[PDB]
Amino acid sequence: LTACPEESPLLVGPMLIEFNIPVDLKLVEQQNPKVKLGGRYTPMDCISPHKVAIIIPFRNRQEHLKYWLYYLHPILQRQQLDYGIYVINQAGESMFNRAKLLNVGFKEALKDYDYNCFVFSDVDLIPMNDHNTYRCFSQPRHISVAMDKFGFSLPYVQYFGGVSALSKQQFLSINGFPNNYWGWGGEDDDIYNRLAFRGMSVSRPNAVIGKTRHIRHSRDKKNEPNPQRFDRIAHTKETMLSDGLNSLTYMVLEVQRYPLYTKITVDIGTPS
Ligand SMILES: O=c1ccn([C@@H]2O[C@H](COP(=O)(O)OP(=O)(O)O[C@H]3O[C@H](CO)[C@H](O)[C@@H](O)[C@H]3O)[C@@H](O)[C@H]2O)c(=O)[nH]1
Ligand SMILES: [Mg+2]
């Protein structure tokens, strides 16, 4: 086997993405036979240098997940990546903590395979063009740059939410993501600040290839806007050394391998 081509030849470009067609995971699996237990896939006809762990923060979003799986697996295989899907499920009914869930995902995934790239994706975001590769780059990568919920515009140049990817070393170099952001908002801005403070820039696909669709939904109870988010992101400089991968604590309650993804239910504590 030889190293895969820089740009995969199975790419079709823009795709039709819609969510009023409720799916069947059984069909998904039948339609994606190369997907090994736990949502794992390795190209059989070339060597991909991208060992990608896709981490999805999760809590009561099965319907979104189904659509996510229906759409990304065929896409990811055409992108010729050697990947695994990790749904990090917050146990309990306390305040949601997206970023801490993403950290847990980084550590747990590494216990399965030697991934060197991490794609952090909201459960409700689907790329509209398979040319927007779900891999890592020389600089941190903002993948969902043109979301339809933002009329295909970046809400602001430093926006880093939705879907992003960090090589294993870029992630480590910033001490991971913060574990101290409970509730909705700001966590993505803190992460951006970290990348900046570490002297890194953000890489992005053009607005066309980066178009992506957001599954319309209402606010979830227990993930209400975090009023402390403004003060927190204003002090990332002072807190990233101690709040991160080095101070991460959690309790894996269960690991389930579904045919299309691995579900890790974890207890990540409460607002300290
Ligand atoms: O009860 C919940 C709350 C959140 N999530 C997960 O966390 C993600 C973000 O939560 P929401 O989609 O409600 O939030 P938004 O659509 O506003 O998400 C946007 O703003 C967020 C504020 O924290 C994140 O920064 C972000 O990635 C961005 O896409 C979801 O995609 C999902 O993966 C759940 O599974 N269950
Ligand atoms: Mg959303």
Curated annotation (Swiss-Prot):
Mn(2+) binds at D124, H217. The soluble form derives from the membrane forms by proteolytic processing. It is an enzyme of class 2 (transferase). Disulfide bonds join C4-C46, C117-C136. Pathway: Protein modification; protein glycosylation. It catalyses: D-glucose + UDP-alpha-D-galactose = lactose + UDP + H(+); an N-acetyl-beta-D-glucosaminyl derivative + UDP-alpha-D-galactose = a beta-D-galactosyl-(1->4)-N-acetyl-beta-D-glucosaminyl derivative + UDP + H(+); N-acetyl-D-glucosamine + UDP-alpha-D-galactose = beta-D-galactosyl-(1->4)-N-acetyl-D-glucosamine + UDP + H(+); a beta-D-GlcNAc-(1->3)-beta-D-Gal-(1->4)-beta-D-Glc-(1<->1)-Cer(d18:1(4E)) + UDP-alpha-D-galactose = a neolactoside nLc4Cer(d18:1(4E)) + UDP + H(+). One of its GO terms (biological process) is galactose metabolic process. Keywords: Cell membrane, Cell projection, Disulfide bond, Glycoprotein, Glycosyltransferase, Golgi apparatus, Lipid metabolism, Manganese, Membrane, Metal-binding, Secreted, Signal-anchor, Transferase, Transmembrane, Transmembrane helix. N-acetyl-D-glucosamine binds at G186, E187, D188, D189, R229. Detected in milk (at protein level). GO terms for cellular component: basolateral plasma membrane; brush border membrane; desmosome; external side of plasma membrane; extracellular space; filopodium; Golgi apparatus; Golgi cisterna membrane. UDP-alpha-D-galactose binds at P57, F58, R59, N60, R61, F96, N97, R98, V123, D124, W184, H217, S218, R219. It comes from the Eukaryota. Residues 1-272 are lumenal. Its cofactor is Mn(2+). Its EC number is 2.4.1.-, 2.4.1.38, 2.4.1.22, 2.4.1.90. Belongs to the glycosyltransferase 7 family. Homodimer; and heterodimer with alpha-lactalbumin to form lactose synthase. Interacts (via N-terminal cytoplasmic domain) with UBE2Q1 (via N-terminus); the interaction is direct. This is Beta-1,4-galactosyltransferase 1. It comes from Bos taurus (Bovine). The lineage of its organism: Eukaryota, Metazoa, Chordata, Craniata, Vertebrata. The chain holds residues 131 to 402 of 402 of the full protein.
